[PDB]
Write a protein that binds this ligand. Structure first.
Ligand SMILES: CN1CCN(Cc2ccc(-c3cnc(Nc4ccc(C#Cc5cc(C6OCCO6)ccn5)cc4)nc3N[C@H]3CC[C@@H](O)CC3)cc2)CC1
Ligand SMILES: CN1CCN(Cc2ccc(-c3cnc(Nc4ccc(C#Cc5cc(C6OCCO6)ccn5)cc4)nc3N[C@H]3CC[C@@H](O)CC3)cc2)CC1
Ligand SMILES: [Cl-]
Ligand SMILES: [Cl-]
Ligand SMILES: [Cl-]
Ligand SMILES: [Cl-]
Ligand SMILES: [Cl-]
Ligand SMILES: [Mg+2]
Lengths: 236, 250
């Protein structure tokens, strides 16, 4: 209630995309400093307290929810553009791993606060002006096997592994050749996302540990965040 | 004389399901031939007259119709499946080895050769796309799923006027070359299906892939020219693709 903003401080503009229960739009937020800020517009007070560069920060509420502007949009669509000329230059492995470290750092933050991000995917990750990724939106091919049957932080670890696959493949859709209805039986028989072509075995061993049948056998986000930071260290 | 294309039902043994057609499912089966030997086939589910016009086709880059049962379409079995899924797999180390450019062009040439054969008979393939292209046992591509009855494959003029000419097939083929050059990417990343007409109407087209040759992109770009009369025919495309392929090392 403390951070609800006066509606008449918000100028709405064009649509940027669609949402779960409405549209996402650009906007200008007039601040207490006097200047106007470019924002995106669509309980939530529990996220005004969230403070982490790799987590996306709530500015206020008008119902409309006032969020920052990530001029590079979602990570998923950004990965596909990179594979096209005119779009961003071909993303090397180092930059790809940095995308995974930022997300792990953000999930390491929310997991320590016992917050579950039930729709973690490459499409729900946003790119700041400094190319640093931060999680948002907190879909069968991302749901862990145990959650298909019936959700914990170990289920986000699973979805994180799928996101590492989306990044490693630069925008491929998970499980090519498998239909959504075939996923449970496909996973229940012990199959997992195959290894991308030029993906280091060191990197595939990490994302593979995210899909271990028993949730307790999967690593925590803090463990994953370091396995990735250290692999990135070992690269020139 | 339309009896020639109807196969007796008791000559067909159906098995598992392999996928979904737009109007019906797809299944495996055995076709007992006049030769006395059984053939592995796929079975998809006025109609009976077009199948007869197609059973007289004979081209390696065009899938052959073996007959019809009572309705079901009997077709060869391709253990390598469609081209679209084969492109995604190639990017997985478990699947086919990385496909070089030369092999990618041989896919385009094959598809163009089959489409050249169909245009020489005024036959329209009103839904050409990588998913609708099958790989023979020798890796030659043959077009399928044509006849008998996807916004990002329909030509701009066919979206509005509800028209479709051979030049509209050239459009879909141009988008098909894009799928091959990208190894399975969905066309127009960052654009919704409901935005396609306005996107194309303002003059936007598929962006050149990362490593795609400028010469290969100019060919596929010509397929999306606003005026259908400016797009090349399939016989012109096939030769432009065959010559570019010969200009590369073995
Ligand atoms: C490369 N190229 C560059 C130019 N691009 C154009 C473009 C257009 C818009 C934006 C953008 C800008 N800002 C935002 N903000 C945003 C962030 C997250 C959500 C969601 C959710 C959510 C967000 C929050 C939150 O509150 C404060 C901070 O975070 C809390 C709980 N849930 C929605 C909007 N989106 C943005 N995009 C959304 C719009 C639709 C959405 O479904 C996916 C991404 C970016 C780029 C195209 C690509
Ligand atoms: C153990 N068991 C399990 C693992 N299996 C792996 C497997 C399974 C199936 C096939 C396969 C094999 N053959 C085919 N052939 C095929 C060809 C064309 C169509 C279509 C058709 C159609 C054709 C016409 C036409 O008739 C004459 C001219 O035009 C009109 C409308 N529709 C469907 C299947 N697909 C196949 N699959 C396609 C089916 C459509 C799509 O889902 C992609 C894959 C391959 C591998 C196999 C073994
Ligand atoms: Cl407003
Ligand atoms: Cl996979
Ligand atoms: Cl049967
Ligand atoms: Cl054939
Ligand atoms: Cl594009
Ligand atoms: Mg979303």
């Amino acid at each position: 209630e403390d951070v609800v903003i006066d509606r008449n401080l918000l100028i709405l503009g064009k649509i940027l995309g669609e949402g779960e229960f409405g549209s996402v739009m650009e906007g200008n937020l007039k601040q207490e400093d006097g200047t106007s800020l470019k924002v995106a517009v669509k309980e939530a007070a529990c996220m005004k307290d969230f403070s982490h560069p790799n987590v996306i920060r709530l500015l206020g509420v008008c119902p409309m929810v006032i969020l920052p502007f990530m001029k590079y949009g979602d990570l998923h669509t950004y990965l596909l553009y990179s594979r096209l000329e005119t779009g961003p230059k071909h993303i090397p492995l180092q930059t790809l791993l940095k995308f995974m470290v930022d997300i792990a750092l953000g999930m390491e933050y929310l997991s320590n606060r016992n917050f579950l991000h039930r729709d973690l995917a490459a499409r729900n990750c946003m790119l700041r002006d400094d190319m640093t990724v931060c999680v948002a939106d907190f879909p069968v091919k991302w749901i862990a096997i145990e959650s298909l049957a019936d959700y914990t932080s170990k289920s986000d670890v699973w979805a994180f592994g799928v996101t590492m696959w989306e990044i490693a493949t630069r925008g491929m859709t998970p499980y090519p050749g498998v239909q959504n209805h075939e996923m449970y039986d496909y996973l229940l028989h012990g199959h997992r996302l195959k290894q991308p072509e030029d993906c280091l075995d060191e990197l595939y061993e990490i994302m593979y540990s995210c899909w271990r049948t028993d949730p307790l056998d999967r690593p925590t986000f803090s463990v994953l965040r370091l396995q990735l930071e250290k692999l990135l260290e070992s690269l020139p």
